[PDB]
Amino acid sequence: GDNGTMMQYFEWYLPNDGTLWTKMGSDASHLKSIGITGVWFPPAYKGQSQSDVGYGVYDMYDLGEFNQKGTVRTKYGTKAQLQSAITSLHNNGIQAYGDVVLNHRMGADATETISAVEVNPSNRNQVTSGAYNISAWTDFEFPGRGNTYSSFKWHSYYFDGVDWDQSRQLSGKIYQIQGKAWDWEVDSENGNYDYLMGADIDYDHPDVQTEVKNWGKWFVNTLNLDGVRLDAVKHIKFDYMSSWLSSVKSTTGKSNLFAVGEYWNTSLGALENYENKTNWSMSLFDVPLHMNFQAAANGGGYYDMRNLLNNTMMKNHPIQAVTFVDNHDTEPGQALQSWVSDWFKPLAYATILTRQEGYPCVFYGDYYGIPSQSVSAKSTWLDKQLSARKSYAYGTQHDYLDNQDVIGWTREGDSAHAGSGLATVMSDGPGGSKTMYVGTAHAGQVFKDITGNRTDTVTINSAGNGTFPCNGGSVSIWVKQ
Ligand SMILES: C[C@H]1O[C@H](O[C@H]2[C@H](O)[C@@H](O)[C@@H](O)O[C@@H]2CO)[C@H](O)[C@@H](O)[C@@H]1N[C@H]1C=C(CO)[C@@H](O[C@H]2O[C@H](CO)[C@@H](O[C@H]3O[C@H](C)[C@@H](N[C@H]4C=C(CO)[C@@H](O)[C@H](O)[C@H]4O)[C@H](O)[C@H]3O)[C@H](O)[C@H]2O)[C@H](O)[C@H]1O
Ligand SMILES: OC[C@H]1O[C@H](O[C@H]2[C@H](O)[C@@H](O)[C@@H](O)O[C@@H]2CO)[C@H](O)[C@@H](O)[C@@H]1O
Ligand SMILES: OC[C@H]1O[C@@H](O)[C@H](O)[C@@H](O)[C@@H]1O
Ligand SMILES: OC[C@H]1O[C@H](O)[C@H](O)[C@@H](O)[C@@H]1O
Ligand SMILES: OC[C@H]1O[C@H](O)[C@H](O)[C@@H](O)[C@@H]1O
Ligand SMILES: [Ca+2]
Ligand SMILES: [Ca+2]
Ligand SMILES: [Ca+2]
Ligand code: NA
């Protein structure tokens, strides 16, 4: 009955030095000590170059094992290093979740000359040219792997489209391969959002349907995975992704394989439509809660803190909510830049770590810092919040989201976790106090601030109430001294 806590074990700007798998393995016992129970590791297969973060997917059967793209290792290291790291996580009781990129492929071995039409980038259902022959990056043969594990080769007729004609080099185009149709259902932004980048996989094609299930089975088996992080699920045929997840569970013996999808949309309704169309079979990153954390941070005291959880997965669908403050895309300089400022970050982490709703995900970029962007490591204060979650965030919750600035909640504690119970209080503005119910069983106990932000103590009265303060623009988490 211990709380679960995920860590995203990478950030965008890590050096291309083939050390991440070695570090992850060495970190396992430390991650266990701070309460991390699952690790999301980056795309572990060969990208279009050695330095690829992993999203520019070339060969999903090359886990840093084959001489392809001028390298054996990936950015992160070798197959054997990743396997050793997962053995070390499992030796420490930590789940391993592999990033799974199924939308597209990049770094084709060869061009193919194929018939295509242009479509409106704002309305991909609208054809805007006659048919003509383009030079497309659609031929994937993987000669460096030489058919090891899989003889499957990719050609144009397994893709729906590309955004580049190597023969004409025109910018701002999207090409639909002749005879192909955008997959459905996908997100309807730009009319049909199947196409994102690269060579867009055709999930209408039955050879592709079979092959990508076969790959999924091989990947989970090969690395003995507990779960998957599914990339760009709003751009992949909804009913196929649902079928893919059922198939891998059934074939790998991983009947309860954990799945969290990235459906990047700021409106809850989009995430609810996805869950509806995939039978509520997977969790989703709580993108709306991340936007709420950004709006509060960016409001400089004037945000209404009563609204912090509104229109979120965490409030509305907590079983399926993977809550986060920042990720590799929201960090400075990246594609979804929407960074939660240092001052607010502890309030955001206290929200996801001490509440009963959601599966929180700690960002590597927050814990260990982002030196290339002058982002300080936050591990010193994160370790105290993670202690709050590991040891104290148990039992019945009472919410006091009843002030524009000062909000809080309590956990009563449960018998399985000795000394458990807490009161979280926080302000986006001036400091304040909240009288909150931690439980009559705490009557006469003295509470301290496990964050160390406050050095005063709080005595629980006989009615099970304390008056819990915080500093301005700060959080305190009150536990039994
Ligand atoms: C980053 C997220 O993008 C999408 O988000 C959209 C929203 O959906 C939309 O509503 C609105 O908010 O705009 C957003 C930004 O566009 C997407 O929905 C979401 O799933 C994405 N996060 C995921 C997905 C991916 C992709 O798998 C990850 O993306 C990251 O890695 C990308 C690939 O390296 C990188 O893309 C940039 O670089 C590539 C190289 C380039 N592609 C061209 C280049 C080549 C070969 O070099 C050829 O293949 C073609 O000519 C081109 O397609 C892109 O043009 C460029 O954008 C991306 O920056 C990076 O974020 C992401 O990490 C996941 O978490
Ligand atoms: O932390 C390991 C834990 O992860 C998953 O449990 C999730 C669950 O699926 C979600 O619905 C939500 O409540 O968060 C849980 C994590 O606390 C795995 O399914 C589970 O087996 C595993 O122990
Ligand atoms: O150092 C320059 C900037 O770095 C960003 O990542 C921060 O959020 C800013 O508040 C800061 O001013
Ligand atoms: O929003 C556009 C979508 O409308 C419909 O559902 C069509 O079946 C689909 O092919 C199309 O892309
Ligand atoms: O959303 C606008 C900007 O808001 C904040 O300043 C964020 O730190 C930055 O990442 C984002 O780009
Ligand atoms: Ca697609
Ligand atoms: Ca199609
Ligand atoms: Ca406020
Ligand atoms: Na497609």
Residue numbers in the entry: 4 to 484
In the authors' words:
The complex of AliC with acarbose was solved by molecular replacement, with two molecules of AliC in the asymmetric unit, at a resolution of 2.1 Å. The structure of AliC was determined in the presence of the inhibitor acarbose. As with many (retaining) α-amylase complexes [some examples from the author’s laboratory include those reported in Brzozowski et al., Davies et al., Brzozowski & Davies, Dauter et al. and Offen et al.], the acarbose is observed as a transglycosylated species, here a hexasaccharide which contains two of the acarviosin disaccharide motifs. An initial ligand-bound structure with a transglycosyl­ated acarbose-derived oligosaccharide at a resolution of 2.1 Å revealed a noncovalently linked glucose moiety, hinting at a putative branch-accommodation site around the +2/+3 subsites. Of particular interest to us was the observation of a ‘lone’ ordered glucose moiety that was not covalently linked to the acarbose-derived oligosaccharide in a position that could be indicative of the accommodation of branch points at either the +2 or +3 positions of AliC. An additional isolated glucose molecule, modelled in both α and β anomeric forms (occupancy set at 0.5 for each and in different orientations; omitted from Fig. 1 for clarity), was observed near a potential +3 site. We speculated whether these isolated glucose moieties could provide insight into branch-point recognition. At the time of writing, structural similarity searches using PDBeFold showed that the closest three-dimensional match to AliC is the B. halmapalus α-amylase, with 67% sequence identity and with 479 aligned Cα atoms overlapping with an r.m.s.d. of 0.49 Å (PDBeFold Q score 0.95, Z-score 27.8).
